[PDB]
């Protein structure tokens, strides 16, 4: 899909 989401995931795990 050429119009699939190309951006990073802002809700990925940010903790240690």
């Amino acid at each position, epitope marked *: *899909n*050429p*119009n*699939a*989401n*190309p*951006n*990073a995931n*802002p809700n990925a795990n940010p903790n240690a």
Partner: antibody
Amino acid sequence: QVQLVESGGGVVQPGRSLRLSCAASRLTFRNFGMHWVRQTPGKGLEWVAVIWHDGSNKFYADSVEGRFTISRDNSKNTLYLQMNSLRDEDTAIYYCAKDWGGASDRVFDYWGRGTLVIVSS
Amino acid sequence: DIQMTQSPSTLSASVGDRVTITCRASQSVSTSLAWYQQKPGKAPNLLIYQASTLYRGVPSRFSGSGSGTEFTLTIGSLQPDDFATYYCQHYNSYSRITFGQGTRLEIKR
């Protein structure tokens, strides 16, 4: 404010190459996919290519498939467009555009000033 | 690819009037449609996405509707700043992005 600045345009002959560049500033560049859009002399708009945040995926308009190559360098916040086998039909203003970030919406929120590309013999 | 055709190519109107321009797609796009505003010598500006959702900072007098193959952009009441060129753009799944040819909004006299 987010700012995009394109460069590398000019007058080129048909059949030759030209590399476009777009410098981002005040923007988490590595977070967003980046597009290229061009505007022909008839004011029509044409989407050229897209690249994902990590460069893992790239797509192209059918008119430039195999001749154009999009790429980016996250450490320098720079987007690239390698154009090969250029034709008169590619004469346009070339904008680099930022993908909005909406998961469902491939819309462009921020545009550069554009860079002019004239393909003429 | 999908062909986007806008109606009309030039709309005559006066400040205060209510204007509607149409965008038609050669195959269904669902709600994956956006509207842009462009003024001479500048890049386009985003107005509506997902057929009817207003982009942030766009005045409330812009509205949008439609689904499938017919969409309309509506300006509730024109202001001097609203004279420009408007493009529709789709981003339908598994369909490469294309734009309409644009509609020119001119002042009536």
